[PDB]
Structure formats: C-alpha cells, structure tokens
C-alpha cells in the first residue's frame, strides 16, 4: 500500500513503500531539523520549512516527470524500476546538507577546513550509503524489482554526477535523459529547482509566476544534436521566462538579503568559536567536531540545526564566546554592513581562500591615517555566489521529435561586514575595504 501525503505545494503525494521505508530512517528524518533557507528564517518569519519537505517534493516531482515521459513515449523504454530509481534520487538528493543548509558547505567548512574539498552533494552520496546499510534497504529495493548494485550507482550518479566519452555507469547512454531530472548539470533546470522555487515563494510571501505542472505535463524527449535530451513545448516559452524571473526575484529579494546573509556569517562565526569544544560521537564512540563530523556519517546523522541551540543553551565557559555571538542575533545586535564589490574582470574567489580574506582586508593600508586600528578578526568577508539561457531545447507540434529582451545576468559579489559597532570603527572598516578593493582589482564600492 502507498502512503499518501498532503503537501501544501503539490497536494496529495503517493509514496511507494520502498520510498516510505527509506524515509522512515534516522538518516532521512534528520532533514526535519535543518532549515531550508538557513538564516533566512530570522528575516522571513514564514520561511520555517526544512529540508524534509523539500526532499519529499523533489522525489514526487522527479517521479512525475519520469512517469510522464514514459506514458507519452513508450519507445524510450522507461521501466517501473527506472521510475523508482529517479524517485529515490530526488528523495535523497539533499541527504548531505549540514546545519542551516548552504551555510555549512558554502561558508563554514571552507572557513574551518580550507584544505578539504567538500560539498553537500558528496555528503548526500555518503549519507545515502549509510542509510541503506544501517537500515537493511538493499533487500527492500531487491523486493521491489531493483538490482541494487546497478541501481545504487545510478541513484548516486544523478545526485553528484559522474562518480569517476559517456561517464555514467548506472544507465546506458540511450537513457541519458534520466540524468537531467534530479540535478541537471547542463542547464541547471531540474525538478529540484522547481520544488524550492514554488516552496520558497509559498513560504517567503513572494509570488510564483511559473507553472511547473505545465512543464511536466508537456515535456517530451527529443533528439538534439545526436543526443537524447528533455525538450519543452514551444507554448511553454512564456512559462520558461517566468521561471527565470521568479528565480531572479527569489535571489535579489530573499537569497541575497543583506541581513539574512549577515546572520549566516554570525552563525558561522559562533560555530567556528565552538568547533574546538562541541562533541559529536560517531562510529565506535569516537568524538567528532562540527567541522570533522562530515568525515563519519554516524556523527553527521546527529549534526543538525540543534548545534545552534546546544551552543545557545550551554553553560560551559568554553562556549561563552560562541554562545554570546548567538545571543547577539536574538538581541538584533548584528554585524554591520560595510560595503559591496565584485571581481569584474578578475578570477572569482575560491572556497580555499575564504579564510585568508579577512586578513587581507586588515593588512590593506589606507592612505588616510586612522585613529582606530582594526585587525583581521574584526572583519567578515561574505562571498555570495550564484551557482543556460539558450541551453533549453524546444519541440513544435509538427515535429515533436525534433528540436527547433531576457532577464538580467549577474555573477559573484563580495560583501564585507565589521564586528565592531562604534562609529569610529565603521569608518576605518570602510577605509580598509575601499583600499582592499583597490589593490585587489575589484570594483570600486558604491558610496
């Protein structure tokens, strides 16, 4: 029997028993305790949604798209085992997110361990493996028509990409269109984008002006340059524009919110000041750190937004520095905005250099003398990244099996904040920053 789920975005969702068995695990239920938008909840009171609902919706949307392509085109040979593997992929694609979602792999892990290369997608693959073996899922997948060894590789591949000339090994090239459903690496348009476009709009108080149901209802696999890709109906071009406007409207208003991104760096700052003292017991009882729990998936299972409240409710004097940074958020005595810049015509800043940025800003010597000397610890440097226009294929009515004034386009933008709150300190921080942008060949900060 299939469990039914009432989602405020998708209505009733029928979940396959194999999906239900995967959901009913502590590795999956930990997504209940990770905010979708991280620190954005502290600016948008309606954005209380977690990764749990979003993962349920992506699996539903992933199965909706793959099942629609099979019913319209039986020649593609999309099996029910294929539909299940895409559902599991969409359901488990975000298994590797840390506390407060992109706050963790985007900022904290680069700041805590700059030498390691870590993404939440690679954590999804590892946590997916931990979920399967700790809960005996392989016999259940086998029971529902899945060949686990081929299908586990297939599910991991559509989550993270090639695990190691056709580079995918879970499905042959004649089923390549299935790799565009959960996490489209080519144009970035997938059922993941659609879920949290509609989910964030519904929770933030922003309007969604595109119909993802229209996209799935009229999607068709057509041949584009000796390749089988997922093509859209020509009548959906206006729906596609509205999707990009919605994505743009979501970024400028919500994702790139100035206070919401300051609170992200404040939670990151407290996490860094607590990283030497918080204990997370993993495999065999070994105690891990917040930055090292990404190395053992048993410890990572217990690393959620709870770390925020464990620090906040702590009485240990060792966590006093981290605890009072978090109490600053409650009192709304936040870090102060200094300015903004962009590396126009320059190499984009890499994650491995994030930790060196506050020290470069402090060493930047302004020509004007200053009666307050600031150090690197007083500076916060926030690198806000984004991540296709002519990479969507369209099909007409006459040839359904053949391909036929836009939005503003931005890139990396760098913001600097100051932990000091006194007028004289904010002036120097601006001196350091405008100086920094100069010898760093970045755009002049707009006064």
Indicate which residues carry an active-site annotation: 120
Choice from 32, 235, 320, 391 touching a second copy (CB under 8 A): 32
Which among 258, 425, 428, 419 has a CA at the least distance from the CA of 324?
A: 419
The mark string for 59-88 relative to a second copy (x by CB under 8 A, - otherwise) is: ------------------------------
Choice from 18, 37, 38, 53 touching a second copy (CB under 8 A): 53
Nearer to a second copy, 33 or 255 (CB): 33
In sequence order, which ranges of 281-377 are alpha helices (DSSP H)?
Answer: 297-300, 306-312, 320-331, 357-363
Question: Which option in a second copy, Fe ion, none does residue 94 bind, with CB closer than 5 to 8 A by kind?
Answer: Fe ion
Report the alpha-carbon distance of residue 371 to residue 348 in Å, rounded.
33
Choice from 48, 344, 356, 385 touching a second copy (CB under 8 A): 48
Say if residue 336 carries a ligand binding annotation. Answer: yes
In the chain the first and final C-alpha atoms are separated, in Å, by: 62
The mark string for 274-313 relative to a second copy (x by CB under 8 A, - otherwise) is: ------xx---x----------------x-x-x--xx-xx
For tokens 């900060």, name the residue: 445
| Total binding residues toward a second copy, as defined by CB under 8 A | 44
| Residue 29 beta carbon to a second copy: minimum distance, rounded to whole angstroms | 4
| Residue 46 beta carbon to a second copy: minimum distance, rounded to whole angstroms | 4
336 near a second copy, rule: CB under 8 A: no
Question: Which option in a second copy, Fe ion, none does residue 8 bind, with CB closer than 5 to 8 A by kind?
Answer: a second copy
Choice from 315, 371, 373, 446 touching a second copy (CB under 8 A): 315
Question: Which option in Fe ion, a second copy, none does residue 234 bind, with CB closer than 5 to 8 A by kind?
Answer: none
326 Cβ contact list (under 8 Å, min separation 6): 266, 267, 270, 308, 311, 312
Nearer to Fe ion, 94 or 105 (CB): 94
Choice from 1, 4, 6, 174 touching a second copy (CB under 8 A): 6
Report the alpha-carbon distance of residue 142 to residue 423 in Å, rounded.
66
Q: How far is CA 181 from CA 79, 91, 440, in A?
A: 15, 12, 40
For tokens 């506050």, name the residue: 358
419 Cβ contact list (under 8 Å, min separation 6): 269, 335, 336, 377, 378, 379, 380
204 near a second copy, rule: CB under 8 A: yes
| Residue 97 beta carbon to Fe ion: minimum distance, rounded to whole angstroms | 8
Say if residue 94 carries a ligand binding annotation. Answer: yes
301 Cβ contact list (under 8 Å, min separation 6): 26, 27, 30, 127, 130
Report the alpha-carbon distance of residue 347 to residue 337 in Å, rounded.
24
3 state DSSP class of 394: strand
Report the alpha-carbon distance of residue 254 to residue 258 in Å, rounded.
9
261 Cβ contact list (under 8 Å, min separation 6): 39, 382, 384, 415
| Residue 70 beta carbon to a second copy: minimum distance, rounded to whole angstroms | 27
Stretch of 25-33, 263-271, 357-365, 393-401 lying at the interface with a second copy (CB under 8 A): 25-33
For tokens 């895409």, name the residue: 86
Report the alpha-carbon distance of residue 121 to residue 152 in Å, rounded.
15
Nearer to a second copy, 49 or 93 (CB): 49
29 near a second copy, rule: CB under 8 A: yes
Q: Which residues bind Fe ion (CB under 5 A)?
A: 94, 192
Helix (H) or strand (E) holding 44, with range, is none
Report the alpha-carbon distance of residue 69 to residue 82 in Å, rounded.
12
375 Cβ contact list (under 8 Å, min separation 6): 362
Say if residue 348 carries a ligand binding annotation. Answer: no
Residues belonging to the binding site are: 3-4, 6, 24, 29, 32, 36-37, 43, 51, 54, 93-94, 97, 102, 192-193, 196, 200, 214, 233, 235, 239, 247, 253, 255-258, 332, 336, 397
Residues of the shown chain interacting with a second copy in the complex, contacts defined by CB under 8 A: 5-9, 11, 20, 24-26, 29, 32-33, 41-42, 44-46, 48-50, 52-53, 56, 202-206, 280-281, 285, 302, 304, 306, 309-310, 312-313, 315, 327, 330-332
């Amino acid at each position: 029997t299939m469990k039914v789920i009432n989602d405020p975005i998708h209505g009733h969702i029928e979940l396959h028993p194999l999906l239900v068995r995967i959901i009913d695990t502590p590795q999956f239920q930990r997504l209940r305790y990770i905010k979708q938008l991280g620190g954005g909840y502290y600016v948008f009171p309606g954005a209380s949604h977690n990764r749990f609902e979003h993962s349920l919706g992506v699996g539903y949307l992933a199965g909706c798209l793959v099942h629609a392509l099979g019913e319209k085109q039986p020649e593609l040979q999309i099996s029910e085992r294929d539909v299940l593997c895409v559902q599991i992929a969409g359901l488990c694609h975000d298994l590797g997110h840390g506390p407060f979602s992109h706050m963790f792999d985007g900022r904290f892990i680069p700041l805590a361990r700059p030498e390691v290369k870590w993404t939440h997608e690679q954590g999804s693959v590892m946590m997916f493996e931990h979920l399967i073996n700790s809960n005996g899922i392989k016999p259940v997948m086998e029971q529902y028509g899945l060949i686990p060894e081929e299908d586990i590789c297939f599910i991991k591949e559509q989550i993270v990409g090639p695990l190691e000339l056709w580079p995918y090994k879970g499905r042959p090239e004649n089923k390549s269109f299935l790799y565009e459903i959960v996490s489209n690496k080519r144009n970035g348009i997938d059922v993941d984008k659609w879920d949290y476009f509609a989910r964030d709009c519904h929770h933030l108080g922003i309007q969604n002006n595109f119909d993802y149901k229209r996209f799935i209802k009229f999607a068709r696999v057509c041949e584009v340059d000796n390749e089988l890709r997922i093509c859209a109906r020509d009548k959906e071009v206006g729906n596609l524009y509205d999707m990009f406007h919605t994505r743009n409207s979501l970024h400028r208003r919500a994702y790139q919110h100035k206070v919401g991104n300051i609170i992200d760096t404040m939670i990151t700052d407290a996490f860094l000041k607590a990283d030497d003292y918080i204990e997370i017991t993993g495999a065999g009882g070994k105690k891990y750190r917040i930055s090292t729990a990404i190395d053992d998936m048993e410890a990572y299972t217990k690393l959620t937004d709870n770390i925020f409240l464990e620090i906040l409710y702590s009485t240990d004097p060792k966590l006093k520095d981290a605890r009072e940074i978090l109490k600053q958020i409650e009192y709304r005595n936040l870090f102060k905005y200094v300015g903004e810049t962009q590396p126009t015509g320059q190499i984009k800043i890499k994650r491995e250099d994030y930790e060196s940025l506050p020290k470069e800003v402090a060493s930047a010597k302004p020509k004007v003398l200053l009666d307050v000397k600031l150090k690197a610890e007083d500076f916060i440097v926030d690198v806000i990244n984004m991540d296709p226009i002519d990479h969507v294929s369209f099909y007409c009515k006459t040839a359904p099996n053949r391909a036929i004034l836009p939005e503003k386009f931005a890139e990396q933008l760098i913001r600097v904040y100051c932990k000091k709150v006194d007028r004289k300190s904010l002036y120097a921080a601006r001196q350091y920053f405008v100086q920094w942008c100069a010898d760093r060949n970045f755009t002049k900060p707009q006064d």
